[PDB]
Amino acid sequence: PVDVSVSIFINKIYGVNTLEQTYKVDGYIVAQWTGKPRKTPGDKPLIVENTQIERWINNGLWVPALEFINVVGSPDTGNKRLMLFPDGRVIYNARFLGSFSNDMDFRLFPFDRQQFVLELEPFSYNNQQLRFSDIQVYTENIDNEEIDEWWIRGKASTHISDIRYDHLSSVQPNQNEFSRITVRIDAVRNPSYYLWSFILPLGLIIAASWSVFWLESFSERLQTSFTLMLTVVAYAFYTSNILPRLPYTTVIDQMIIAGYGSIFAAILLIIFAHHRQANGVEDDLLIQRCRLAFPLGFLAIGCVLVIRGIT
Amino acid sequence: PVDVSVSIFINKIYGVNTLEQTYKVDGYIVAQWTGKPRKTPGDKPLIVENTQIERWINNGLWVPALEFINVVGSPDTGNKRLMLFPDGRVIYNARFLGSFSNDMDFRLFPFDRQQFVLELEPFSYNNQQLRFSDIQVYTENIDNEEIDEWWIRGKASTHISDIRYDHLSSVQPNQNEFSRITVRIDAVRNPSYYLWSFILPLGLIIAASWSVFWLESFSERLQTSFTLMLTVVAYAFYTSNILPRLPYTTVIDQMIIAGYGSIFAAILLIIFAHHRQANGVEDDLLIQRCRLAFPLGFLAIGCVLVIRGIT
Amino acid sequence: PVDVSVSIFINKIYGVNTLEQTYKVDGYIVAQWTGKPRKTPGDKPLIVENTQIERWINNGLWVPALEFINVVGSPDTGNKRLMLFPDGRVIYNARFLGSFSNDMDFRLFPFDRQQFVLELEPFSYNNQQLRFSDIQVYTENIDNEEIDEWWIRGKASTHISDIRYDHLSSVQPNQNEFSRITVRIDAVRNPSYYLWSFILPLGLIIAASWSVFWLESFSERLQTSFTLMLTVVAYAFYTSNILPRLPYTTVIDQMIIAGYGSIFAAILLIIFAHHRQANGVEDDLLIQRCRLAFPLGFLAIGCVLVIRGIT
Amino acid sequence: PVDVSVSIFINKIYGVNTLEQTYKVDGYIVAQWTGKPRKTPGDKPLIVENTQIERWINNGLWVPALEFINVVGSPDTGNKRLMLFPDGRVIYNARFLGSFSNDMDFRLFPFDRQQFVLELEPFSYNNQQLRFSDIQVYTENIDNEEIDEWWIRGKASTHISDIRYDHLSSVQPNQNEFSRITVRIDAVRNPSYYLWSFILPLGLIIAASWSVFWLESFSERLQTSFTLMLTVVAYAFYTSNILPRLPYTTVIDQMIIAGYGSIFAAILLIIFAHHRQANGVEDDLLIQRCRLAFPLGFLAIGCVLVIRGIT
Amino acid sequence: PVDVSVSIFINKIYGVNTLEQTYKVDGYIVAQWTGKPRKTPGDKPLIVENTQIERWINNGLWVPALEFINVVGSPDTGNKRLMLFPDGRVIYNARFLGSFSNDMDFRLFPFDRQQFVLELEPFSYNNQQLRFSDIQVYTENIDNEEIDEWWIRGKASTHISDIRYDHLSSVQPNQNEFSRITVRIDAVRNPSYYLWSFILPLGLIIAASWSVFWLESFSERLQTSFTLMLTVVAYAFYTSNILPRLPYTTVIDQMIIAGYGSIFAAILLIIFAHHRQANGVEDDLLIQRCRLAFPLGFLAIGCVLVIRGIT
């Protein structure tokens, strides 16, 4: 069992695709193992660069294929290098840009924290255990930069497992177990653009929508309700266009549905207050109580949705 | 007739393109057959990896081309492997990402269920019957995940057919029949984002549009109708932008046309109630009957469109 | 002059790009000719698959380059095959996906019928006449499917011409004439989504815009005109976003300009009726005549634009 | 100095990218020179097609690299051909699709005329003067077609220059001068969609905005001003979405800013007319003079912007 | 230590991607070093062009791999050339189009100035010090052209550093130090389209929004406030659609939030002025003071945001 020692350098993580759950990683792979004691010119390490590798493998060199289990498609391998020492050591270095995939949950959209995962595994060998994994990730930013979309929390976390494929069953003296190197980087979204542009103005719009009860006659109250509802649909479109596509309702979309509910409740209460014989036009005490209780009730249901969302 | 035994692993299905009817599948192919009893170093299976295959086919190895009948373009084959046993067995393993196509019917758009289909077939041989197909699909999600866009119902369904090409007619002692492996995965859309954001608010808007009859004078009734119609066109745009493109009207678009019809009917009834000499300004009993019958009539036609849509 | 016999299979036509006038075709080419009587193992047809062709051409085989004259870029040739019979016959089969181009006229946009054209021609030979063309197109749909964007009318129409290049003039004993295979498929757009969503609601909006004359005082008439014009600009945007880009006005855009004209005429007539001393506020017979004649005049100009559009 | 004789065929020019200043050209290159008197089978021209060229250059053939100076990236060279005559002549023919770039000025956007430019130059030789350039461009359209986005004025204009690179200075007996072939095609945009959809409706909207002065009381005048301004912002968005992106204001955007200015001036004049003690509610002669002078003043500033734009 | 002398030519910089922080550069690389005194035909420089290089490296030529540290993916290397002099000199010339990345701060969006950076470094050698860097950048434009999106300030600034990789530690007699060539070009955005289209109209809209206090009765004041807020949300959408995506609030977005705050404050003050018993309908001196102080207060907070933004 040849022991392969891996080291992954991460240069940048970007381009998260919310609907396809795929991000993009760019960096380096350095896999080092020990072979036979070859002889090299000058008794110095020999360097084989990009296209001259493929004429070294044809001669009989052993370069395994380390594939990314979770990549989508095929990584855009740029320059690759292969340095052969005299005592046997071989160091295969390559630069990759891949569009990886994971299982990400965007339900708390503006405040969510994700976990970017790379999984590495030899393509075709099972007695080639990957011996020791290291990540240098110090090139993301200075530290959780305030102009960055994703603040990365702490260093990357590595792991080496023995994945068992129970469908192969070739001879099965433990002949279907592949070593696997999993790395996870914890990231947190930057909730600043989505808090000062999409949540504050919507809070202002809803709180102003409660002012319709402050008017005087029934006709103008019910008239300006329709304008308010038009405002809300315009805002709902504004938000929908900018925000990423998703198959489920985020935190922001629930605020918009709450706005729709608030305006519909305003129309219902306006109509009811107009058509009760006790308070048709006389002694309209219902409207004052409504001004007292409508904001409190909406804030109660807002706290309910917050507590059911954070859970 | 060499018997090829196939096994397809599905890793992820994503990126459904509604207008082009093409989805994307990523996974593995494992095709295994039996050849001549070759001799290998150490009497162990020999592994040939990516670019060293093409110098084994030139020497005289027999590796058939298994093509996907329904793919669009050419699959983005990543790592490919070829393992040659001593007793004869050959196992060709490859990783593919392809943009497949089918005949999908999105007419019940938010509640539709589709059938993702892969079709596999040897490119150039007719006496190479594909012997036995298997699918392992256990890597989609845990099970019909609530954060997934498509819930996959049950295991995949396989089939092996003998497609006849009646245009070749080379010699025709059954010399134009190709074996074919068809696999179908039943999927169901996740109708949660499209039910709490595009259908509930539109129901609220229409039900509020019926409130225009509750006003007092003709001028203000007909005035606020125009604002309502502006609201509906704004909503129709909001819906159109988010939803996928299609050549026919889904369930949601029929709700919007029903909204247009409802508001136009409201304007017609307002005008008629203003210009009948029996009920010009006197004894306006038509408006009350309208408040009684307009929502019921619209709900009747809504049930009609629902029953004609589910059929 | 070697006679090449062609057969083109069409699997799917999709992705029409209105602004660039390019569509996409996916299918097969089968070109068959007769060469020298070679000797093959077993006296059976020999099959040469994808990458092993290029080491047969280097040995001295004659495989001409059949190019598509009107393709854009280079077709995404997938699997290609080459079957060599003993008596001489050679059959070159290839699978192509190309983004072809034509000269399409989208002026009657929702009701237009186009003609998809493929043009094939040997790249470098003039005494290689293409002998006989066939198209099997039976894989588009069942027949003009109701869930399809383009209904294809009838079978494909083929043609073989002798294109003359008058700029070469190499020796000119008819040494600058290339055979050419042209195929045309007649297609008709599916005018169902564009008729129940973009034309019916606009008809309703315009017909409701004529109701402004039914109000009572001048101030409110001219006030609700502005709201109507806002409605129309919102609709014009809705239509513009969904519809394809074009350098000229389709049928739908003319309806929107007619709507703009109708509302501007309404404002002009409202102002004029307010400021005529005969009918300032007294004996307003002009408004009634306007209600009689405005819809008829607009319908007349609509019939005029229809007759000038269908021509 | 080998004299290379060039001939460029243009098949189609499309896909102008206003923000990146890159268009796309598709066509053919035919470069012909004279070499040594080789010997060919049958004493006839020998044709070398696509992938068999690269095994003729390795043997010692001289095929220079003719690069496009101004291309972006690398042209998508499709089929390439190379015909070797016995007396020496060599004719290299290739089909290219490239995304070229120029310095285009879109300031008069809907009425602008551009100049598509291709620049050709040997990649590495300076004593390889390009002898004679020809363009056949007769395949654009029939002539300046009315369904075309760009009407091409007249034939293409060619030029052969001696570009001097003053930074090389290798030996400098005129050892840093490269021949260059420049071709320019004059094109004119089709100002029909942008004149009947984006300019006429905006003229109507502005001319209707001047009607606000025709109302009666101050409150309703200033009220309907706000609706007008909303109309204009909606239109400004409609225009912005369809039109191409640019770093400077076109002709259309200046009309929208003029609309904003007109409505703001209307509000200022309404307020001033309400708050002058001479004409508070009495003897309102200022409003009539305003109706006389506001359209004339706006038309004056419009003529000013037109004269400063055409310059 | 072979001294490599570099010279980079920049042809165009375009396509800045604000959200991914990647721009695109197109140009040439010229790296020149001195090797052994080879023998060439005719004792003249020998030119090796595109695909014939790879058969010179296989023979034993030494061509290092100069990689761009900060590129994203792999540059689209077009034509490459290699000129071998007799006395030893070798000149490797290549044409590249790459999508580079940097750390750009778009916080002052319309008035920001950026610094485009290229970083070059040998892929695999540490004793190959890069000796002397030069940039010719004279092909951007004439000078800071008024039709250009980015005005480039002054010439490019170069630098040669010794980057130390402290993780290699192979033998460490200074065996982990790579030379690096960094080049920086200072660019300034063109703030003309974003100043006459997105800032001037918004200033006009806000300044007109202050006119609501000039109306007479409470009902109409609070009514036209809602229309104003709808105007602002429409404008906020217009701006959001055109402007680039970002994870933080630019200068323009702060103006929109200020507009939201101004209109909400207007509603609050209208309501308060309606419901104070001292100035319910009598002696409404609060409204006049509000007209005096509201614009001044908003301008004060605007100056505050400007001073906190420029810092």
Side-chain angles (χ1 to χ4, degrees), chain D residues 251-264:
Chain D
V251 163
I252 296 187
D253 297 344
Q254 293 164 10
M255 286 193 93
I256 294 168
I257 310 156
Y260 283 128
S262 171
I263 292 176
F264 190 53

Side-chain angles (χ1 to χ4, degrees), chain B residues 199-210:
Chain B
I199 280 184
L200 182 64
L202 183 60
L204 305 182
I205 292 171
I206 286 177
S209 176
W210 293 332

Side-chain angles (χ1 to χ4, degrees), chain D residues 67 71 74 124 219 237 275, chain E residues 28 49 76 95 214 220 237:
Chain D
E67 77 161 356
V71 71
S74 56
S124 55
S219 171
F237 165 54
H275 187 193
Chain E
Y28 292 82
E49 224 121 353
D76 186 74
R95 157 150 204 166
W214 263 87
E220 51 201 358
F237 165 54

Side-chain angles (χ1 to χ4, degrees), chain E residues 179-200:
Chain E
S179 277
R180 165 171 289 192
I181 284 178
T182 311
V183 300
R184 313 167 180 279
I185 303 166
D186 302 318
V188 169
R189 176 160 265 142
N190 180 13
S192 184
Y193 173 49
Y194 306 97
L195 199 78
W196 285 97
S197 286
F198 297 143
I199 280 184
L200 182 64

